[PDB]
Amino acid sequence: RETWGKKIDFLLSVVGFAVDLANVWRFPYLCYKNGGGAFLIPYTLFLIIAGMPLFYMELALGQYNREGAATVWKICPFFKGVGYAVILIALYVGFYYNVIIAWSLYYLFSSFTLNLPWTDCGHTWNSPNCTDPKLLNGSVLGNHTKYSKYKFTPAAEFYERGVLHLHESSGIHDIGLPQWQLLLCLMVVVIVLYFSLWKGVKTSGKVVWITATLPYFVLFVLLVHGVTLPGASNGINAYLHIDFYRLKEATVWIDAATQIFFSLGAGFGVLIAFASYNKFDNNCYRDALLTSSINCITSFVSGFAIFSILGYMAHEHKVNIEDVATEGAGLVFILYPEAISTLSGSTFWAVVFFVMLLALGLDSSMGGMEAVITGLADDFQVLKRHRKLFTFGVTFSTFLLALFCITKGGIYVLTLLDTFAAGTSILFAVLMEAIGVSWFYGVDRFSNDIQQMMGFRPGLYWRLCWKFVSPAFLLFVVVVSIINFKPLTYDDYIFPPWANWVGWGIALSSMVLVPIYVIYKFLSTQGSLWERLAYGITPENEHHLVAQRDIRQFQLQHWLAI
Amino acid sequence: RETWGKKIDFLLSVVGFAVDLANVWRFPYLCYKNGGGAFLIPYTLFLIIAGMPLFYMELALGQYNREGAATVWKICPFFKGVGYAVILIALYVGFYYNVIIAWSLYYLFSSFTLNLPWTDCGHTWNSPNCTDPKLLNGSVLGNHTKYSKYKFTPAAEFYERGVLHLHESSGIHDIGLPQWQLLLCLMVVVIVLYFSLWKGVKTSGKVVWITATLPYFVLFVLLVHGVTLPGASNGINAYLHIDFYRLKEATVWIDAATQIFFSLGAGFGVLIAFASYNKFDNNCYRDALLTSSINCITSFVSGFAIFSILGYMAHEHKVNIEDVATEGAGLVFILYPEAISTLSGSTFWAVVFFVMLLALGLDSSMGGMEAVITGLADDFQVLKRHRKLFTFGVTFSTFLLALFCITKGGIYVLTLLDTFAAGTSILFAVLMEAIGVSWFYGVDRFSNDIQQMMGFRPGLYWRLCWKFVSPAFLLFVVVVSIINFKPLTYDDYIFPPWANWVGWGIALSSMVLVPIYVIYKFLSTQGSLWERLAYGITPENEHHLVAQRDIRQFQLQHWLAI
Ligand SMILES: [NH3+]C[C@H](O)c1ccc(O)c(O)c1
Ligand SMILES: [NH3+]C[C@H](O)c1ccc(O)c(O)c1
Ligand SMILES: [Cl-]
Ligand SMILES: [Cl-]
Ligand code: NA
Asked if A177 reaches chain B (Cβ–Cβ under 8 Å), the answer is yes
Summarize the annotated binding site of A for Na(+) as residue ranges: 16, 18-19, 23, 263, 295, 363-364
Is B328 marked as binding a ligand? no
Taking the CB of residue B137, how many other CB atoms lie within 10 A of it? 10
Q: CB-based contacts of A1: which residues, under 8 Å, 6+ apart?
A: A66, A276, A277
Measure the CA–CA gap between A62 and A269, rounded to whole angstroms.
Answer: 9
Asked if A134 and A126 count as a contact pair (C-beta separation under 8 A), the reply is: no
Q: What is the DSSP letter of B19?
A: S
CB contact under 8 A, B176 and A174: yes
Experimental technique used to determine this entry:
cryo-EM
Asked if B331 and B306 count as a contact pair (C-beta separation under 8 A), the reply is: yes
Measure the CA–CA gap between A248 and A261, rounded to whole angstroms.
Answer: 21
Q: CB-based contacts of A534: which residues, under 8 Å, 6+ apart?
A: A546, A551, A553, A554
Three-state DSSP state, B151? coil
Taking the CB of residue B64, how many other CB atoms lie within 10 A of it? 19
Q: Measured between beta carbons, which residues in chain A are less than 8 angstroms from residue B173?
A: 176-177
Distances (CA, A) of A402 to A100, A133, A181, A194, B153: 10, 30, 13, 15, 43
Backbone phi and psi for residue A153, each to the nearest 5 degrees, phi listed first: -110, 155
In the reported structure, the alpha carbon of residue B295 is separated from the centroid of ligand 4 by a whole-number distance in angstroms of: 6
Asked if B316 and B229 count as a contact pair (C-beta separation under 8 A), the reply is: no
Q: CB-based contacts of B322: which residues, under 8 Å, 6+ apart?
A: none
Measure the CA–CA gap between A108 and A102, rounded to whole angstroms.
Answer: 10
Dihedral sign (CA A392, A396, A398, A402): positive
Is B56 marked as binding a ligand? no
Single out the residue of B431, B458, B438 nearest to residue B559, CA to CA: B438
Burial of residue A180 (CB within 10 Å: 0-12, 13-18, 19+) is exposed
Measure the CA–CA gap between A329 and A25, rounded to whole angstroms.
Answer: 7
Backbone phi and psi for residue B489, each to the nearest 5 degrees, phi listed first: -155, 150
Burial of residue B101 (CB within 10 Å: 0-12, 13-18, 19+) is buried
Ligand 1 pocket member A535 (CB < 6 A): no
Ligand 2 pocket member B16 (CB < 6 A): no
Measure the CA–CA gap between B324 and A353, rounded to whole angstroms.
Answer: 65
CB contact under 8 A, B176 and A173: yes
Please give the radius of gyration of chain B, using alpha carbons only, rounded to the nearest integer. Answer: 24
Q: CB-based contacts of A246: which residues, under 8 Å, 6+ apart?
A: A34, A35, A38, A39, A252
Residue B23: nearest ligand to its CA? 4
Asked if B51 and B260 count as a contact pair (C-beta separation under 8 A), the reply is: yes
What dihedral do alpha carbons B86, B91, B92, B97 form, nearest 10°? 120
Asked if A174 reaches chain B (Cβ–Cβ under 8 Å), the answer is yes
Q: A243 in the Ramachandran plot: left (φ > 0), alpha (ψ -120 to 50) or beta?
A: beta
Which are the residues after which chain B is interrupted (C to N > 2.5 Å)? none
Q: Measured between beta carbons, which residues in chain A are less than 8 angstroms from residue B498?
A: 177
Ligand 1 atom closest to the CA of A372, numbered from 1: 9
Asked if A63 and A453 count as a contact pair (C-beta separation under 8 A), the reply is: yes
Q: What is the DSSP letter of A117?
A: G
Ligand 1 pocket member A421 (CB < 6 A): no
Asked if B52 and B264 count as a contact pair (C-beta separation under 8 A), the reply is: no
Measure the CA–CA gap between B57 and B442, rounded to whole angstroms.
Answer: 12
Q: Which amino acid is at B136?
A: L
In the A/B pair of chains, how many CB contacts fall below 8 A? 9
Backbone phi and psi for residue A489, each to the nearest 5 degrees, phi listed first: -155, 150
For chain A, the straight-line distance linking the first and the last C-alpha, in angstroms and rounded, comes to: 33
Q: Which amino acid is at B322?
A: E
Burial of residue A141 (CB within 10 Å: 0-12, 13-18, 19+) is exposed
Q: Where do runs of H (alpha helix) occur along B115-249?
A: 154-157, 180-197, 208-211, 214-226, 232-239
Paired with B494 in beta bridges are B489
Three-state DSSP state, A199? coil
Ligand 2 atom closest to the CA of B92, numbered from 1: 9
Residue B20: nearest ligand to its CA? 2
Distances (CA, A) of B124 to A500, B110, B155, B183, B342: 32, 10, 12, 21, 19
Measure the CA–CA gap between B543 and B533, rounded to whole angstroms.
Answer: 11
Asked if B539 reaches chain A (Cβ–Cβ under 8 Å), the answer is no
Candidate from B13, B20, B97, B261 with most ligand 2 atoms within 8 A of CB, to mutate: B97
Three-state DSSP state, B368? helix
Residues with CB under 5 A from ligand 5 (ion): A 20, 22-23, 263
Measure the CA–CA gap between B274 and B59, rounded to whole angstroms.
Answer: 8
DSSP conformation letters of A312-373: HHHHHHT--TTTSS--STTSHHHHHHHHHHHSSSHHHHHHHHHHHHHHHHHHHHHHHHHHHH
Domains of chain A: 7-524 (1.20.1740.10), 525-562 (no CATH)
Ligand 1 pocket member A93 (CB < 6 A): yes
Single out the residue of B413, B517, B374 nearest to residue B87, CA to CA: B374
Asked if B446 and B60 count as a contact pair (C-beta separation under 8 A), the reply is: yes
Asked if B177 reaches chain A (Cβ–Cβ under 8 Å), the answer is yes
Single out the residue of A139, A152, A274, A263 nearest to residue A208, CA to CA: A274
For chain B, the straight-line distance linking the first and the last C-alpha, in angstroms and rounded, comes to: 33
Single out the residue of B114, B127, B194 nearest to residue B164, CA to CA: B127
CB contact under 8 A, A173 and B173: no
Candidate from A93, A95, A189, A373 with most ligand 1 atoms within 8 A of CB, to mutate: A93
3-state per-residue secondary structure call for A478-547: HHHHHHCCCCCECCCCECCHHHHHHHHHHHHHHHHHHHHHHHHHHHHCCCCHHHHHHHHCCCCCCCHHHH
What dihedral do alpha carbons A120, A125, A129, A130 form, nearest 10°? 80
Dihedral sign (CA A80, A85, A88, A93): negative
Ligand 1 pocket member A265 (CB < 6 A): yes
Candidate from A101, A268, A274 with most ligand 1 atoms within 8 A of CB, to mutate: A268
Residue A19: nearest ligand to its CA? 5
Asked if B235 and B314 count as a contact pair (C-beta separation under 8 A), the reply is: yes
Q: CB-based contacts of B224: which residues, under 8 Å, 6+ apart?
A: none
Nearest CA in chain A to B178: A173
Measure the CA–CA gap between B242 and A140, rounded to whole angstroms.
Answer: 79
Asked if A486 and A254 count as a contact pair (C-beta separation under 8 A), the reply is: no
Asked if B173 reaches chain A (Cβ–Cβ under 8 Å), the answer is yes
Ligand 2 pocket member B365 (CB < 6 A): yes
